[PDB]
Amino acid sequence: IKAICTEAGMFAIREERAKVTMLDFTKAIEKVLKKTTPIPDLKGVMFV
C-alpha cells in the first residue's frame, strides 16, 4: 500500500506535475500489484 503511493508520485514526475492525482493512483495499483502476484491462473477450463 506504501509502494502504490510511492509509485503514483513517480507517474507524476514523468508527466511533470507536482500534484498527485486520481489517475496516477489507478496506474500505480496496476503497476504494483501485477509485479507482486499473478492473480488468476484459469481454473474454469480444467474444472467445472
Partner 1 sequence: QMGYDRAITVFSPDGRLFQVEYAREAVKRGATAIGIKCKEGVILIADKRVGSKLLEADTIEKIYKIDEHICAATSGLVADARVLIDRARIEAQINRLTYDEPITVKELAKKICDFKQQYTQYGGVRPFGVSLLIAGVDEVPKLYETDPSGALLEYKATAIGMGRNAVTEFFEKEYRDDLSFDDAMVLGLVAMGLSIESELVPENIEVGYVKVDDRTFKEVSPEELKPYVERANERIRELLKK
**Closest CB 42 distance from partner 1, rounded Å:** 7
Query: Residues in the chain, how many?
Result: 48
User: Where on the chain is the footprint of a copy of itself (CB under 8 A)?
Assistant: 2-3, 6-7, 32, 35-36
Nearer to a copy of itself among residue 18 and residue 36 (C-beta): 36
**Closest CB 4 distance from a copy of itself, rounded Å:** 9
Question: For residue 19, what is the DSSP state?
Answer: S
**Closest CB 28 distance from partner 1, rounded Å:** 18
What residues contact 7, with CB distance under 8 A and at least 6 apart?
A: 28, 31, 32
